[PDB]
Amino acid sequence: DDVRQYVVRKPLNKEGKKPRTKAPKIQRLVTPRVLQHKRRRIALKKQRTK
RNA sequence: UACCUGGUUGAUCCUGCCAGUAGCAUAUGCUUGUCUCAAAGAUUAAGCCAUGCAUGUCUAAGUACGCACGGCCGGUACAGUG
């Protein structure tokens, strides 16, 4: 299950400022970039063996 | 530029040093218009030190929920600057 729909967002409201919400960047989140990095590492291993 | 000169005697020839002579380094005195370089708290005390400064550092690429700013949509995980 994804965790992006449970990140605690803090509401921001300041005197004279438009209100908004803030969420942190989720660490150790498996993302396509992470899998691509893992696959590139595996491909480098393949290339070295060959 | 491989150079000497005065001084021992009544006079002479010597040994011989003293004193002259030129540079170079520090100091000092007097004087000083232009211009280019340029040493400089070593010598005595590696003595003692008020104060300020002399060592900091971020890229697309470690960690950004500081509205501290801030949007080409804001249920956006993380826009961006930081």
PDB file of C-alpha atoms (C1' of nucleotides) in Angstrom:
ATOM      1  CA  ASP A   1       0.000   0.000   0.000  1.00  0.00           C
ATOM      2  CA  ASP A   2       1.127   3.553  -0.678  1.00  0.00           C
ATOM      3  CA  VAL A   3       2.016   5.957   2.129  1.00  0.00           C
ATOM      4  CA  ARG A   4       1.542   9.233   0.235  1.00  0.00           C
ATOM      5  CA  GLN A   5      -2.132   9.305   1.274  1.00  0.00           C
ATOM      6  CA  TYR A   6      -1.248   9.195   4.981  1.00  0.00           C
ATOM      7  CA  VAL A   7       1.553  11.769   5.268  1.00  0.00           C
ATOM      8  CA  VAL A   8       0.684  14.169   8.072  1.00  0.00           C
ATOM      9  CA  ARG A   9       0.364  17.554   6.352  1.00  0.00           C
ATOM     10  CA  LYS A  10       0.697  20.603   8.555  1.00  0.00           C
ATOM     11  CA  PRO A  11      -1.691  23.483   7.762  1.00  0.00           C
ATOM     12  CA  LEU A  12      -0.008  26.869   7.378  1.00  0.00           C
ATOM     13  CA  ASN A  13      -1.913  30.066   8.151  1.00  0.00           C
ATOM     14  CA  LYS A  14      -0.065  33.321   8.783  1.00  0.00           C
ATOM     15  CA  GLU A  15      -1.327  36.841   9.389  1.00  0.00           C
ATOM     16  CA  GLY A  16      -1.508  38.270   5.876  1.00  0.00           C
ATOM     17  CA  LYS A  17      -0.558  35.018   4.115  1.00  0.00           C
ATOM     18  CA  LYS A  18      -2.590  32.671   1.955  1.00  0.00           C
ATOM     19  CA  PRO A  19      -3.221  29.393   3.812  1.00  0.00           C
ATOM     20  CA  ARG A  20      -1.736  26.184   2.467  1.00  0.00           C
ATOM     21  CA  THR A  21      -0.517  22.745   3.517  1.00  0.00           C
ATOM     22  CA  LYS A  22       2.981  21.317   3.841  1.00  0.00           C
ATOM     23  CA  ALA A  23       4.227  17.743   3.702  1.00  0.00           C
ATOM     24  CA  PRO A  24       7.757  16.362   4.048  1.00  0.00           C
ATOM     25  CA  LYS A  25       9.651  14.482   1.384  1.00  0.00           C
ATOM     26  CA  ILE A  26       9.164  10.812   2.226  1.00  0.00           C
ATOM     27  CA  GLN A  27      12.452   9.003   2.810  1.00  0.00           C
ATOM     28  CA  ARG A  28      13.050   5.340   1.929  1.00  0.00           C
ATOM     29  CA  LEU A  29      10.116   5.517  -0.481  1.00  0.00           C
ATOM     30  CA  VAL A  30      10.484   2.998  -3.289  1.00  0.00           C
ATOM     31  CA  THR A  31      10.160   5.043  -6.484  1.00  0.00           C
ATOM     32  CA  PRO A  32      10.898   4.396 -10.169  1.00  0.00           C
ATOM     33  CA  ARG A  33      14.196   6.270  -9.784  1.00  0.00           C
ATOM     34  CA  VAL A  34      15.259   3.952  -6.950  1.00  0.00           C
ATOM     35  CA  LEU A  35      14.420   0.856  -8.990  1.00  0.00           C
ATOM     36  CA  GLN A  36      16.247   2.314 -11.990  1.00  0.00           C
ATOM     37  CA  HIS A  37      19.341   2.884  -9.840  1.00  0.00           C
ATOM     38  CA  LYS A  38      19.161  -0.713  -8.608  1.00  0.00           C
ATOM     39  CA  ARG A  39      18.776  -1.975 -12.179  1.00  0.00           C
ATOM     40  CA  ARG A  40      21.748   0.103 -13.341  1.00  0.00           C
ATOM     41  CA  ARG A  41      23.845  -1.413 -10.554  1.00  0.00           C
ATOM     42  CA  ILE A  42      22.803  -4.908 -11.655  1.00  0.00           C
ATOM     43  CA  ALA A  43      23.562  -4.041 -15.288  1.00  0.00           C
ATOM     44  CA  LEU A  44      27.032  -2.820 -14.313  1.00  0.00           C
ATOM     45  CA  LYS A  45      27.619  -6.146 -12.563  1.00  0.00           C
ATOM     46  CA  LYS A  46      26.498  -7.934 -15.741  1.00  0.00           C
ATOM     47  CA  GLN A  47      28.824  -5.818 -17.873  1.00  0.00           C
ATOM     48  CA  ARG A  48      31.809  -6.453 -15.611  1.00  0.00           C
ATOM     49  CA  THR A  49      31.221 -10.210 -15.700  1.00  0.00           C
ATOM     50  CA  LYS A  50      30.874 -10.202 -19.493  1.00  0.00           C
TER      51      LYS A  50
ATOM     52  C1'   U B   1      94.463  48.384 -11.810  1.00  0.00           C
ATOM     53  C1'   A B   2      98.853  42.111  -9.197  1.00  0.00           C
ATOM     54  C1'   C B   3      99.667  50.004  -6.136  1.00  0.00           C
ATOM     55  C1'   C B   4     101.154  51.793  -1.451  1.00  0.00           C
ATOM     56  C1'   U B   5     102.013  56.613   2.119  1.00  0.00           C
ATOM     57  C1'   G B   6     103.353  59.483   7.131  1.00  0.00           C
ATOM     58  C1'   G B   7     105.710  58.158  12.009  1.00  0.00           C
ATOM     59  C1'   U B   8     111.784  55.610  15.983  1.00  0.00           C
ATOM     60  C1'   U B   9     117.600  58.924  13.911  1.00  0.00           C
ATOM     61  C1'   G B  10     121.879  64.594  14.241  1.00  0.00           C
ATOM     62  C1'   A B  11     121.480  61.939   9.539  1.00  0.00           C
ATOM     63  C1'   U B  12     121.307  56.570   7.145  1.00  0.00           C
ATOM     64  C1'   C B  13     119.757  51.508   6.044  1.00  0.00           C
ATOM     65  C1'   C B  14     116.399  48.025   8.342  1.00  0.00           C
ATOM     66  C1'   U B  15     112.834  44.886  11.440  1.00  0.00           C
ATOM     67  C1'   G B  16     108.403  46.272  12.969  1.00  0.00           C
ATOM     68  C1'   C B  17     103.981  47.890  14.213  1.00  0.00           C
ATOM     69  C1'   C B  18     100.823  52.341  14.768  1.00  0.00           C
ATOM     70  C1'   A B  19      98.192  55.729  11.514  1.00  0.00           C
ATOM     71  C1'   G B  20      96.556  56.753   6.793  1.00  0.00           C
ATOM     72  C1'   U B  21      93.726  54.289   1.898  1.00  0.00           C
ATOM     73  C1'   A B  22      89.219  51.779  -0.778  1.00  0.00           C
ATOM     74  C1'   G B  23      84.933  48.720  -0.387  1.00  0.00           C
ATOM     75  C1'   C B  24      81.109  46.432   2.481  1.00  0.00           C
ATOM     76  C1'   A B  25      77.432  46.245   6.806  1.00  0.00           C
ATOM     77  C1'   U B  26      74.577  48.209  11.163  1.00  0.00           C
ATOM     78  C1'   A B  27      74.018  52.929  13.837  1.00  0.00           C
ATOM     79  C1'   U B  28      74.292  58.023  13.910  1.00  0.00           C
ATOM     80  C1'   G B  29      75.030  63.356  12.478  1.00  0.00           C
ATOM     81  C1'   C B  30      74.134  67.375   8.928  1.00  0.00           C
ATOM     82  C1'   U B  31      71.560  68.144   4.166  1.00  0.00           C
ATOM     83  C1'   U B  32      67.810  66.798   0.630  1.00  0.00           C
ATOM     84  C1'   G B  33      64.528  69.088  -5.614  1.00  0.00           C
ATOM     85  C1'   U B  34      62.672  64.965  -9.699  1.00  0.00           C
ATOM     86  C1'   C B  35      62.073  59.797 -10.828  1.00  0.00           C
ATOM     87  C1'   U B  36      62.322  54.004 -10.840  1.00  0.00           C
ATOM     88  C1'   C B  37      63.310  49.889  -7.705  1.00  0.00           C
ATOM     89  C1'   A B  38      63.564  48.472  -2.861  1.00  0.00           C
ATOM     90  C1'   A B  39      65.397  46.241   2.889  1.00  0.00           C
ATOM     91  C1'   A B  40      62.915  47.221   7.298  1.00  0.00           C
ATOM     92  C1'   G B  41      61.703  44.864  15.980  1.00  0.00           C
ATOM     93  C1'   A B  42      67.149  39.674  13.347  1.00  0.00           C
ATOM     94  C1'   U B  43      71.354  41.458  16.905  1.00  0.00           C
ATOM     95  C1'   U B  44      69.524  43.307  23.267  1.00  0.00           C
ATOM     96  C1'   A B  45      64.259  40.371  25.548  1.00  0.00           C
ATOM     97  C1'   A B  46      62.307  32.305  21.958  1.00  0.00           C
ATOM     98  C1'   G B  47      60.700  39.273  26.828  1.00  0.00           C
ATOM     99  C1'   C B  48      55.237  40.602  28.067  1.00  0.00           C
ATOM    100  C1'   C B  49      51.065  41.685  25.446  1.00  0.00           C
ATOM    101  C1'   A B  50      45.029  45.678  25.689  1.00  0.00           C
ATOM    102  C1'   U B  51      41.993  45.566  21.006  1.00  0.00           C
ATOM    103  C1'   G B  52      40.407  43.983  15.990  1.00  0.00           C
ATOM    104  C1'   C B  53      41.461  40.623  12.272  1.00  0.00           C
ATOM    105  C1'   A B  54      44.398  36.204  10.395  1.00  0.00           C
ATOM    106  C1'   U B  55      39.969  29.199   8.529  1.00  0.00           C
ATOM    107  C1'   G B  56      36.478  28.133   6.619  1.00  0.00           C
ATOM    108  C1'   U B  57      33.304  25.408   3.345  1.00  0.00           C
ATOM    109  C1'   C B  58      27.001  23.454  -0.889  1.00  0.00           C
ATOM    110  C1'   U B  59      26.581  21.453  -5.990  1.00  0.00           C
ATOM    111  C1'   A B  60      21.522  19.276 -10.664  1.00  0.00           C
ATOM    112  C1'   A B  61      23.656  15.459  -7.569  1.00  0.00           C
ATOM    113  C1'   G B  62      23.886  13.563   1.528  1.00  0.00           C
ATOM    114  C1'   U B  63      19.666  15.392   5.225  1.00  0.00           C
ATOM    115  C1'   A B  64      14.526  21.004   3.941  1.00  0.00           C
ATOM    116  C1'   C B  65       7.054  19.854   7.202  1.00  0.00           C
ATOM    117  C1'   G B  66      11.555  27.252   9.571  1.00  0.00           C
ATOM    118  C1'   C B  67       5.350  30.447   5.043  1.00  0.00           C
ATOM    119  C1'   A B  68      11.789  33.140   6.191  1.00  0.00           C
ATOM    120  C1'   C B  69      10.191  34.196   1.211  1.00  0.00           C
ATOM    121  C1'   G B  70       7.244  31.753  -2.336  1.00  0.00           C
ATOM    122  C1'   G B  71       3.711  29.268  -7.843  1.00  0.00           C
ATOM    123  C1'   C B  72       2.330  27.697 -14.578  1.00  0.00           C
ATOM    124  C1'   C B  73      -3.363  23.723 -11.068  1.00  0.00           C
ATOM    125  C1'   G B  74      -2.092  22.515  -5.051  1.00  0.00           C
ATOM    126  C1'   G B  75      -6.493  15.582  -2.391  1.00  0.00           C
ATOM    127  C1'   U B  76      -0.321  16.994  -5.134  1.00  0.00           C
ATOM    128  C1'   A B  77       4.946  12.952  -0.490  1.00  0.00           C
ATOM    129  C1'   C B  78       8.748  16.292  -1.999  1.00  0.00           C
ATOM    130  C1'   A B  79       7.582  23.195  -7.189  1.00  0.00           C
ATOM    131  C1'   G B  80      11.455  26.630  -6.252  1.00  0.00           C
ATOM    132  C1'   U B  81      14.998  29.979  -3.298  1.00  0.00           C
ATOM    133  C1'   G B  82      16.597  28.850   1.245  1.00  0.00           C
TER     134        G B  82
END
